[PDB]
Every structure is written in structure tokens, then in C-alpha cells.
């Protein structure tokens, strides 16, 4: 009984005989099995008898001999003049749709808080705010063309007033709950909730549509996403990341891995993409905590980041404010609304089309210490209404994996190159200064760069892939991978060939509806194609 044989042995004595098993159809299963056969049979037993006495004489060849010749797979050659550029859609220009603006942001530094200072973010934001003088009367500079702008003005004024009116309290609070005002209620959309009733009472009503089943609009490509990508690959004066330590190394392979990762960490430590990752992680974590804590209050959430200065002083930076609505989340798909306000110095009247879902206010003047003297520039506030998800908060909290992916890509290239020249290639890649990689373009032609530049480019690409997820990206990536593999096979003198080159193309254009990132990727692919065979 221990090994698992007692049950069958016990259930095998039918009087004074031994029977192995028993199983019969005997009923409705028989009738059901009766019409689960090819059309030229009626009983299962006859089909079994026919199958048992089967011998293959000539069936396959005989069937093949009488099939029409239009069923075929003909190969057409792939030459150097075969491929054609991909067609991009045309229409009105696209607009920014990111959660927080990237290139047009400033910070209000706290200037090296004490080493023992660990407090609530609200007090840090207040101390950052008290360091600025130059507020003026705010006024609208760019209407939203869909909504009410005085509501935005009143919201900003209420934020200022309720931040200033803390002192009228006998006890100092920990978090701030905003008063439910008409403009705030309109901004958070608390009065635009449809009512639900059974279909029986409202069967006779008119003007009823299925749902928002409308064909998506078509938009073209602008020149600001390329500028954002260009700016995202530059170096800063801060650190933005500090990793912990591990044990000492003994084996030579440990030394090789250590030098590889040390070079990689040194090259991409001061990049802007790390700042974006930290900003996103902090904002998403704070918003998730606030949403999970308070469910029936309008809480004020600051945008705060931390870094280390060049000489070695910790610094805290404030970006803006977020006001959250009502959050009663039962599943992972329910949406919570909020409104975001951010500071900037960029005049919106240079690219009005870029900002289409924003309201822009002028709020003050800023003194610049660059060169000698002091010059004043206007200060602007961008206000927008949004609401993301519960899942996407978790999606935004994991952005440290992009560094891991970039390191994996670099190490994969190093290993692939070292596998052919059977020796160690970690030295010829990093410390060699006469090697250049083509990762650029200009009216002159193709430019060149160093290893740190390509590492930062890969990190920025991973970050932007994380920040602009969409199925169009997946489809375009797959089809472009297939096309690139075909092109590379062509370049190796291997005589490639295809069966249907068009359908791949129409797939490529049908995965090219609206996303500016995918349009930029398609333009990059076209620019690669125009040079790969010339």
C-alpha cells in the first residue's frame, strides 16, 4: 500500500476470478460518438474495423496528381533595388501625452538640508517654496479651447491660499486635505457621472448609441520628439543613483565582470534618463500610497526628488503639485482622476500644437545668475487633468530594470564578438579610444561616437520604450525585425528570397496609426534603409 498498488489490487477480485480493468460506453456517450466520424460512416465499430485493416497503397501520390497547379509557393528574388520606403500617415501634428513633462522642467532646490533631517514631504515642499520671491498676479497665456480657464486660476489661487493658511491651527497636521470647491469639483469631474438603470424602463428612449466605437484619428510626425530624444542623451552635474557593495573578488571571471560593470556604471551614472526614472518611481510610489491611504479626501501630493551634488551635498528638488480626487478601487482596472500643475520657463507660443491638452499661466519672474548682473525671465505654470490606472502605478514603480536591460545588451554584444575572436574583448571595447560607432546622422552623412555615447543612447531608448508603451510598438518591432533579418541576409551574399513581400508592408503601415514614438522609429528605419544599400 505504501508504493501505490493496493487500490487496484483490492478492486480486482470479482468472486473467484481476476479482472484487470473495466470500461464501457453503453449509453448517451455511444450516441454522441456516433456522429463524430467522417461522413461515410454510421457506427464506431465499423470505423474501427476499417482502421484496423488499413494498408497504404498509393493514396498520397494519387491525391496529389489531381490537384490544380495554381496551388504553389513560388520564390521571387530579393535584390538591392527591391525594397521601398515605408509610407507614413498624414494629417494634423501630434501632441505630448506623457504623465510629466521632461525637457521643460526646473527645480526649486532646498540647498543641502541637515544630515539628520528626515521629515514629511509636505514640510520639505513648504521649505522649498519659502525660498522663492517674485510671485505676481497670474494670468492665462494659452487657453485649453475645451473647458473653463477661470477654474484653473481659482484652483491655483486656492492651492496657494490653503498652503499659506497652515498657521491657523492649534495642532500641526501631517497631510493636507483640500476643501471641496466648485472649480475643484469641475476639474476632478465629480458631477459628470452617468446614472445606471435597467434596460426595461428605458427601452423606449431615443438617441441611443452603442458605445464610443469611432475610427481613430490620423496624425503626422512633428520635430519635437527628436529634440526630446536628443536632450535625453546628455550628461548632467549630479549623480542620481548610488548602488551598494558586494564581496571581494577572487576568480578572474569575477575580475572581468567587475571591470565590465564598473565601466558601464561609470559611463551612465550622470545621465538624464536616471533622473527621469527616479522622478517616475518617486511620483508613482507617492501617488499609490496616497490613493491607498485616503479614499474620500482631496489630498495634495508634492513632486519631490533627491540627488547628490558634485562636491558631495545631498539635495532635494521640488517639481510641482498633484491634486487627487476620489479613489474607491475594487479591481485593478478602475481609474482615479487627478490634476497636475508643473513649473516651467518655456514659452508655449513657439509650438502651440505641441501643447493641446494643457492650460498655461504666467505666475512670476525669475532671476538668473548666469554671467555678470541679474536678468529676469517669466515663469509659467502648466495645468492638466488626467487619470491613469491602478496597474500602471505598479508599471511605473519598476523602471530600474532598463539599466539591467542595457547592461545585458552591451554584455551580449561583447560576448558575441568575443566568441569569434576566441579571446577576451572587454579591453578592446572600453579603454580603446580609436574606435568609433555610427549612431548619428547629419546633412553631411553618418557621424560617429564613443562607447559611453552608445550606452547612454541605449539607456535612453529603454527609458522611452518604458514611457510610451503601446501594441503598435510590438507589431512594428516584430515586422521590422523580420525585414531587418531579411536585409542582413541579403548583405551577406546568401541569395535571399521571399514569397509575399507586400503583406509584410501593409502590416507595417497598419501598425502606424497615431503614436509619435512609432512614427519616429519608422523614420529611423527608413533612414537606415536609405544607407544600408547605398
Amino acid at each position: 500500500a505504501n508504493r501505490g498498488l493496493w487500490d487496484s489490487f483490492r478492486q480486482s477480485e470479482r468472486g473467484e476470478e481476476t479482472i484487470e480493468e473495466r470500461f464501457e460506453i453503453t449509453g448517451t456517450m455511444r450516441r454522441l460518438a456516433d456522429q463524430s466520424l467522417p461522413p461515410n460512416f454510421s457506427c464506431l465499430e465499423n470505423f474501427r474495423a476499417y482502421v484496423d485493416g488499413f494498408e497504404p497503397n498509393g493514396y498520397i501520390e494519387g491525391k496529389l496528381s489531381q490537384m490544380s497547379k495554381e496551388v504553389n509557393a513560388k520564390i521571387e528574388p530579393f535584390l538591392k533595388t527591391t525594397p521601398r520606403p515605408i509610407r507614413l500617415p498624414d494629417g494634423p501634428p501630434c501632441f505630448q501625452r506623457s504623465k510629466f513633462l521632461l525637457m521643460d522642467a526646473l527645480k526649486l532646490s532646498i540647498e543641502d538640508p541637515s544630515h539628520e533631517g528626515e521629515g514629511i514631504p509636505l514640510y520639505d515642499a513648504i521649505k522649498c517654496m519659502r525660498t522663492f520671491f517674485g510671485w505676481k498676479e497670474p494670468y492665462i497665456v494659452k487657453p485649453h479651447e475645451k473647458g473653463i480657464n477661470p477654474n484653473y486660476l481659482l484652483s491655483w489661487k486656492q492651492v496657494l491660499a490653503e498652503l499659506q493658511d497652515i498657521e491657523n491651527e492649534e495642532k500641526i497636521p501631517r497631510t493636507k486635505n483640500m476643501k471641496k470647491t466648485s472649480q475643484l469639483k469641475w476639474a476632478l469631474g465629480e458631477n459628470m457621472a452617468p446614472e445606471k438603470v435597467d434596460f426595461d424602463n428605458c427601452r423606449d428612449v431615443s438617441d441611443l448609441k452603442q458605445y464610443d466605437s469611432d475610427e481613430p484619428e490620423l496624425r503626422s510626425l512633428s520635430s519635437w520628439i527628436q529634440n526630446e530624444f536628443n536632450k535625453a542623451c546628455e550628461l548632467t552635474d549630479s549623480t542620481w543613483i548610488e548602488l551598494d557593495e558586494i564581496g571581494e573578488d577572487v576568480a578572474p571571471i569575477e575580475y572581468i565582470a567587475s571591470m565590465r560593470r564598473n565601466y558601464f556604471t561609470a559611463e551612465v551614472s550622470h545621465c538624464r534618463a536616471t533622473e527621469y526614472i527616479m522622478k517616475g518611481v518617486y511620483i508613482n510610489t507617492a501617488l499609490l500610497n496616497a490613493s491607498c491611504a485616503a479614499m474620500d479626501d482631496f489630498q495634495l501630493i508634492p513632486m519631490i526628488s533627491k540627488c547628490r551634488t558634485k562636491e558631495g551635498r545631498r539635495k532635494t528638488n521640488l517639481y510641482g503639485f498633484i491634486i487627487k480626487g476620489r479613489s474607491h478601487l475594487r479591481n485593478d482596472t478602475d481609474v482615479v482622476n487627478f490634476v497636475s500643475m508643473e513649473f516651467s520657463l518655456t514659452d508655449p507660443r513657439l509650438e502651440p500644437h505641441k501643447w493641446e491638452k494643457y492650460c498655461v499661466l504666467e505666475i512670476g519672474d525669475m532671476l538668473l545668475r548666469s554671467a555678470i548682473g541679474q536678468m529676469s525671465r517669466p515663469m509659467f505654470l502648466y495645468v492638466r487633468t488626467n487619470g491613469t490606472s491602478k496597474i500602471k502605478m505598479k508599471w511605473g514603480m519598476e523602471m530600474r530594470r532598463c539599466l539591467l536591460q542595457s547592461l545585458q545588451q552591451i554584455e551580449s554584444m561583447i560576448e558575441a564578438e568575443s566568441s569569434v575572436k576566441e579571446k577576451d574583448m572587454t579591453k578592446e571595447f572600453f579603454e580603446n579610444k580609436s574606435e568609433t560607432w555610427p549612431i548619428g546622422e547629419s546633412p553631411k552623412g553618418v557621424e560617429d561616437g564613443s562607447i559611453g555615447k552608445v550606452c547612454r543612447t541605449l539607456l535612453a531608448k529603454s527609458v522611452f520604450n518604458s514611457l510610451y508603451a503601446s501594441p503598435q510598438l510590438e507589431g512594428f518591432s516584430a515586422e521590422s525585425r523580420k525585414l531587418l533579418l531579411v536585409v542582413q541576409a541579403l548583405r551577406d551574399n546568401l541569395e535571399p528570397g521571399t514569397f509575399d513581400l507586400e503583406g509584410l508592408y501593409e502590416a507595417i503601415e497598419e501598425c502606424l496609426i497615431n503614436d509619435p514614438w512609432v512614427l519616429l522609429n519608422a523614420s529611423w528605419f527608413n533612414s537606415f534603409l536609405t544607407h544600408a544599400l547605398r
Binding site: 490537384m67 509557393a73 452603442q210 564581496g247 571581494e248 547592461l407 558575441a416 525585425r481 514569397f499
Partner: protein, 686 residues
């Protein structure tokens, strides 16, 4: 300078940097499954691909059914599910001839698996559709509900603890004229046809509860058959697939009397799921089980019969809104067969008008096709048969082909003395595949000279078989305690290194990130740190009094000593020789009030945790009550002949008598124990 990484391919080969094309690291935060809209399109497409079949009305369910077997031969390149029984039988016969003894050993190995499987096998898996609550439930709850319902109607045969008895009782249940459903105390009546319909419905696709047991045996047999073939790469994973990829190239590039031309093709199959037919599966099963006991044949043939007549559920329904009264409503698919079509738009109206004939009780009838997943290793064998048909003895010509084929992806190599022979071989392979019911995707397949190809995210250059089939680890905290997370993390990193191709440089940074996350989560920073938390004072007090600071665990101020060479050693055993005697005595004290290669330690604590069946935890109470009398049940399976209550009473009486004899406790409660035991046995007497 305008920077774009694609031009980096102008210097580096594509296969060396192909990892820059995959954009994501995990699951994207969006869903594309769609509700009732996609199922209707799937049904319409799989019925449109087989328009020239034969129509029949079921005599036991009353659902229309379409039979495309032995239909007219195709005339164009569009997908066509018109298969021939003779071709499949001949392919199976030739596969048997090529590898003698391949179908009898598998049956013999499967027979012992059939006769020894227990009922617990169905308790693990994904979510399962429940025919009693019309929802999706975990496997254990669905199984318990099924057992309760079957017992309530006099169908009690699964108490033997055998899966075959459960299948027999399910078959007996399917032949009754009335079914009772008791919900906690509503009592609902189900007739024969309604129960039969609810026993053949597939989800939107996890199967039901009355079909998993029959699918399991077929899957085991298919796996046993596949494990004996060299052209199947499905069961294996890792370096084995690399070796399989190398062997086919080595075999086809023998370069003996080099006057031959070799071309490789990477291909994909279009409309794979909605072109297979369960009838050919039944024919294959019947042919495989020749000269075998009849009960084995019945057990292996039950499942395709059920699959040949199945129902597909639509979904939740639609949502409507009004732009004037600020009104919203939801409409279900149960009454969708009679609603007026003026509400919907053009596409939905066409879908409804097309789908109306095949609608019964809110579920559509879908005979010709496989819904989603399942029966992968049998379609794999069906595909491998066509590849086996490419030997010199069967072509009787100059060209010959061979290759390897997974569930849906395939790579092939063709040898011919010139280009015309290669073209003829490719055309013959295409026609032979189409004659059985497999269609090749023309727009996502390509052919080139041998030396480079691809197979399921396995890129093969001249000698490098680097793979990108699975994702990176999570390097996060598991969430049990502060003594198991470290071991889980290091084991995960080591296992990813051993099986996958994680690099050494990557592992060090993954370990760094994991240690950072662990320190942040458990509030355990180093003693010589200025970070202020609630746990800082105790950590600094412990750090100041320690003379050997290299022996403290990371959980309390200690440093990290982990690297690549010591990922398989517990931390306590690693730091045993570098910590003080008093710290060792305090940490490894088996009398703590607090209490995958882990030591007990004082850091292994427990955190605070916050119809049909009247109570859902009735088995658990008895289970947890058992070990208080027999403490070895937590280590191995118990063996006995009597019931549980007999052991309970005997052990309690023996323990009480010995305790009284030893004088540990006085006589006051000894008589009380005897009386309560007598009351228990009197209650059992009823």
C-alpha cells in the same frame, strides 16, 4: 547630430545586437483580449474557412454541426480545412515504419500511469470554469463543489481515491434525467439537455471540470511519443534545443562529394488553431492504439468525441449610453438573439445577422476547430510526420528535405543538385502540407542559403546559438520573512545563471539591486550609516559592542559578502567562523519566543494575517486536528487500516492513562477524559 540607434546595425551584424529590438521587459499594462466582439469574429472566420462541408442536426443536443472532412480539394492559396483520412493514415503508417516499436512502448508506459493516478491531480492548475456557479473558480473549490453535487444525487464512487472511478462516475452522471442544485437554501432543478449543454461549454480558454481528466491521459501519451523523436523540440528547453539545432545542420552539411545545393527556410503557420479538426485526432488515436485492450482504447478515445461537439460562451455583453439623460446601462448576451438591430452600428449588426442561426441558450456551436491551446504535442506529431515523409526512400527523386518543427514554428532544409530541384521540393512540401490541413504563412516566412536561420527566438549564426526566449528575474522580495527572502533571491539568481544565459556582469548588478531593495524593505541598514529609522538605536547599540563586525548578518547591520562563487551556501554557514560566541549563543537559541537551504535562526517568525458548502474549511479542520495526535503526518504519508476516530480514541486513552500513571496530573480530569471519550464513541455508535 541627430542620434538614432538603428544605424548601429551598419557596423555590427544583426544577430549580434538583435536584443535591442525587444522593447519590453515584462508584461505591458494593457489588455487586447476583448470581450464578446472577438469570439463572434473567431466563430465567423472558422465557419467561413469551411463553407463547403456537410450540415447536420444533433439528435442529443439540437445544435447544428458542420463536417469538412473529405471535402473538395482546394483551388486557391486561401486557408482551407479540408483534410483527408487516407493521407493522415498513410503518414502515420510511414512514421511507424520509419521507427519500429514506437507506438507500443508508449502505450505500455501510459497504461501504468493510468492505473495509478489519484484524484488530487486535478487540484493544481489554472482557474477552472464551474458548471454549478457559472463563474471561474480555483481548481480545489471547483472540485469540492463537483464532489458535493455528485454526492447529493447518489453518485458516490470517487471515495476510492482513483481518477478512473471519478471518470466512470462522471459518465454515469451524464446519463441521468434530472439534476439537483442546492445553494446556501435554494433548490434548483436542471433537466437533461440543459445539463448536457452546461457540460460541453468552453470558457473564453480554460476547459471545464468533466473534461480535464480525459485530456490529461492524451497529453501524457503525446508527451511519451514526442520524447522519442529527434524532430520535436517542444519537451526540451535550454542547451538541449541548442544541441538539437546543431545536429540538424551537421547532418545536412555532410559535404561528402560536394556537388549539392542546400537551402534553409524559416516559416510560420497561419490560422493554426481554427483549421485542426478533432476527427483526425480521433483517427490518430485509433491508429496508435492497435492491438491494445479495449478499455484503454475507450479511455483514450473519450476526449476527442467531446471536443467534436462543444459550445462556446459569448461573454459578458455590451454597454450602452445616452448623451441627453446622462444614462448608462449594460445588456447581456443571453437575450442578444431577439433584440432589435437598430441599436447597434453597422459592423455589430452584420456580426449579429451572421451569428444568429448558431445560438442556443447564449452559447454558440463550434464543431470544426480547436478553441485555444491544448493538444499541442499531438499537432506536433502530426507536423513531424510530414517532415519524416521527406526521406530519399519516399520521395523517389533527387531532392530531399529535413528539418525541425515546434507547435507552430518550423525550420526546413532542402538539398538538390540545382535551383529547379529546390523549387520542386519546396512546392511538393507545400502541397503535401496543404493536403493534410496545414497552411504556411507566405508573408512571414523566408528562405536563404544554409548558415543562418531562426527557431522560436533561437538565433543561429555560423556557430553561435544565443537565445532570447525568456525574461529577466524579478530581484524583489518574496514576502515570507527576513530569513527566507535572501535564500530565495540567491537561488533564483543562481538558477537563472545555470539554465538561461544570464551573464556574470548582469548577476552582480542584479544582486546589488536585490540587496538594496531588501535593506529598504526590512529597515536593516549598516551600523556605520547616518540613515535614521525606528530601528537605528538597537542596530547601533549592537554594532558598538561587537568586536568582529564581519560576522553579523545583513539583517542586523552586517555587511554583504555574497559574490558569484558563493551563491549556493547559506549565510549562517558562511559567517559561522567570523562571529563571536555570545552572538552565536543568542542567535542560535532553540528556546526563542519568536519561532530552500535555510537555518532555523531567531529571524524566522510569522506575520499577522488579516454557496454549495455551508463552511469551506471543513477538511482543513480535520486535517489540522490529526497531527496533534500523530505528529509524523507532516513528514510522510500515513498508512493504516481503520478510520481516523479509532486512532483518535486509542491515542487519547493511551496518553491519558500514561499521564495518570506517571503522576503528572491528578485523578480529577482522568475520569473526565474517560467520560468524554465514552461520549464520543457512543456518538459514533449512531
Amino acid at each position: 547630430m541627430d542620434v538614432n540607434p538603428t544605424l548601429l546595425f551598419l557596423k555590427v551584424p544583426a544577430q549580434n545586437a538583435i536584443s535591442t529590438t525587444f522593447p519590453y521587459t515584462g508584461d505591458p499594462p494593457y489588455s487586447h483580449g476583448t470581450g464578446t466582439g472577438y469570439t463572434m469574429d473567431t466563430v465567423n472566420r472558422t465557419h467561413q474557412y469551411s463553407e463547403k462541408g456537410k450540415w447536420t442536426t444533433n439528435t442529443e443536443t439540437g445544435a447544428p454541426q458542420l463536417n469538412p472532412i473529405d471535402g473538395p480539394l482546394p483551388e486557391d492559396n486561401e486557408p482551407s480545412g479540408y483534410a483527408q483520412t487516407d493521407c493522415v493514415l498513410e503518414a502515420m503508417a510511414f512514421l511507424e515504419e520509419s521507427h519500429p516499436g514506437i507506438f507500443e512502448n508508449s502505450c505500455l508506459e501510459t497504461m501504468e500511469v493510468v492505473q495509478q493516478t489519484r484524484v488530487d491531480r486535478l487540484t493544481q492548475g489554472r482557474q477552472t470554469y464551474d458548471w454549478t456557479l457559472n463563474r471561474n473558480q480555483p481548481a480545489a473549490t471547483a472540485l469540492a463543489n463537483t464532489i458535493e453535487v455528485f454526492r447529493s444525487n447518489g453518485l458516490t464512487a470517487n471515495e476510492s481515491g482513483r481518477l478512473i472511478d471519478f471518470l466512470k462516475d462522471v459518465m454515469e452522471s451524464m446519463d441521468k434525467e434530472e439534476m439537483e442544485i442546492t445553494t446556501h437554501k435554494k433548490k434548483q432543478r436542471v433537466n437533461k439537455r440543459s445539463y448536457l449543454i452546461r457540460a460541453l461549454t468552453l470558457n473564453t480558454a480554460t476547459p471545464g471540470m468533466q473534461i480535464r481528466g480525459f485530456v490529461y491521459f492524451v497529453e501524457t501519451l503525446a508527451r511519451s511519443i514526442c520524447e522519442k523523436l529527434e524532430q520535436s523540440g517542444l519537451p526540451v528547453g535550454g542547451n538541449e534545443k541548442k544541441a538539437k539545432l546543431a545536429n540538424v545542420v551537421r547532418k545536412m552539411m555532410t559535404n561528402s562529394q560536394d556537388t549539392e545545393l542546400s537551402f534553409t527556410i524559416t516559416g510560420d503557420n497561419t490560422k493554426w488553431n481554427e483549421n485542426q479538426n478533432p476527427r483526425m485526432f480521433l483517427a490518430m488515436i485509433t491508429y496508435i492504439t492497435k492491438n491494445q485492450p479495449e478499455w484503454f482504447r475507450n479511455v483514450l478515445s473519450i476526449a476527442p468525441i467531446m471536443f467534436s461537439n462543444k459550445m462556446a460562451r459569448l461573454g459578458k455583453g455590451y454597454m450602452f449610453e445616452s448623451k441627453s439623460m446622462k444614462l448608462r446601462t449594460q445588456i447581456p448576451a443571453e437575450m442578444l438573439a431577439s433584440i432589435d438591430l437598430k441599436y447597434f452600428n453597422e459592423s455589430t449588426r452584420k456580426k449579429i445577422e451572421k451569428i444568429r442561426p448558431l445560438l442556443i441558450d447564449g452559447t454558440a456551436s463550434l464543431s470544426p476547430g480547436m478553441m485555444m491551446g491544448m493538444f499541442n504535442m499531438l499537432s506536433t506529431v502530426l507536423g513531424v510526420s510530414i517532415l519524416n515523409l521527406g526521406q530519399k526512400r519516399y520521395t523517389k527523386t533527387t531532392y530531399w528535405w529535413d528539418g525541425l518543427q515546434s507547435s507552430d514554428d518550423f525550420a526546413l532544409i532542402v538539398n538538390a543538385p540545382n535551383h529547379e530541384g529546390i523549387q520542386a521540393g519546396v512546392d511538393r512540401f507545400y502541397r503535401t502540407c496543404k493536403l493534410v490541413g496545414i497552411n504556411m504563412s507566405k508573408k512571414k516566412s523566408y528562405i536563404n542559403r544554409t548558415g543562418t536561420f531562426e527557431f522560436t527566438s533561437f538565433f543561429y549564426r555560423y556557430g553561435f546559438v544565443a537565445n532570447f526566449s525568456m525574461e529577466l528575474p524579478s530581484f524583489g522580495v518574496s514576502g515570507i520573512n527576513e530569513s527566507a527572502d535572501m535564500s530565495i533571491g540567491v537561488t533564483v539568481i543562481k538558477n537563472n545563471m545555470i539554465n538561461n544565459d544570464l551573464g556574470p556582469a548582469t548577476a552582480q548588478m542584479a544582486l546589488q539591486l536585490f540587496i538594496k531593495d531588501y535593506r529598504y524593505t526590512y529597515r536593516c541598514h549598516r551600523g556605520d550609516t547616518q540613515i535614521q529609522t525606528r530601528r537605528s538605536f538597537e542596530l547601533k547599540k549592537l554594532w558598538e559592542q561587537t568586536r568582529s563586525k564581519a560576522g553579523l548578518l545583513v539583517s542586523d547591520g552586517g555587511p554583504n559578502l555574497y559574490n558569484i562563487r558563493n551563491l549556493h551556501i547559506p549565510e549562517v554557514c558562511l559567517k559561522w567562523e567570523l562571529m563571536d560566541e555570545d552572538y552565536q549563543g543568542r542567535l542560535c537559541n532553540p528556546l526563542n519566543p519568536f519561532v530552500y537551504d535555510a537555518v532555523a535562526t531567531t529571524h524566522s517568525w510569522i506575520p499577522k494575517r488579516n454557496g454549495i458548502l455551508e463552511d469551506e474549511q471543513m477538511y482543513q479542520k480535520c486535517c489540522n486536528l490529526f497531527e496533534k495526535f500523530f505528529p509524523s503526518s507532516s513528514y510522510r504519508r500515513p498508512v493504516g487500516i481503520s478510520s481516523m476516530v479509532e486512532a483518535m480514541v486509542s491515542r487519547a486513552r493511551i496518553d491519558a492513562r500514561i499521564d495518570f500513571e506517571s503522576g503528572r496530573i491528578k485523578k480529577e480530569e482522568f475520569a473526565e477524559i474517560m467520560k468524554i471519550c465514552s461520549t464520543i464513541e457512543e456518538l459514533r455508535r449512531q
